[PDB]
Amino acid sequence: SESELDQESDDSFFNESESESEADVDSDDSDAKPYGPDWFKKSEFRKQGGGSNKFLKSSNYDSSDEESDEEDGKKVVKSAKEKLLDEMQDVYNKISQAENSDDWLTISNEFDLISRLLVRAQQQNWGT
């Protein structure tokens, strides 16, 4: 059995598909409004109807409303009574006693115009 051979042959080798080239990477970040007007200044706002209020009350005249709406008296001692005695002789005549309990209404219905001290003598609105 005889045969022959040869080594001048090939079937596979390297081959490139690329050569001169380049590449890169990039990134970015920012913060601002996309649109819309605005102001940086702060402030505060307030108003009122003049800061006060009026009423329909008025001075006395010929028409009236009521003659009695309270107890007829309460007694009085050690007060503005002690600077009101001896100023007069007729409407003072009960004031030197002041314990009568039931005549103080009748006198206060005229003392409104005689003396504002008599109202203070019976009421004693000093803050106690």
* Contact (CB, 8 A) for 72 and 107: no
Give the three-state DSSP class for 119.
helix
Provide CB contacts within 8 A for 122, sequence distance 6+: 74, 76, 79, 104, 108
Phi/psi for 112 (5° steps) reads: -45, -35
Experimental method: NMR
- Helix H or strand E encompassing 120: helix 116-123
Quick one: which of 88, 111, 69 has its CA closest to 123? 111
Indicate if the alpha-carbon torsion angle 95, 100, 105, 109 is positive or negative. negative
Side chain identity, residue 88: M
Rounded Cα distance, 70 and 92, in Å: 22
Give the separation between CA 33 and CA 72, rounded to whole angstroms.
80
Largest CA distance in the chain: 179
Q: Considering only CA atoms, which of 67, 91, 69 is closest in space to residue 81? A: 91
CA distance 121 to 60: 24
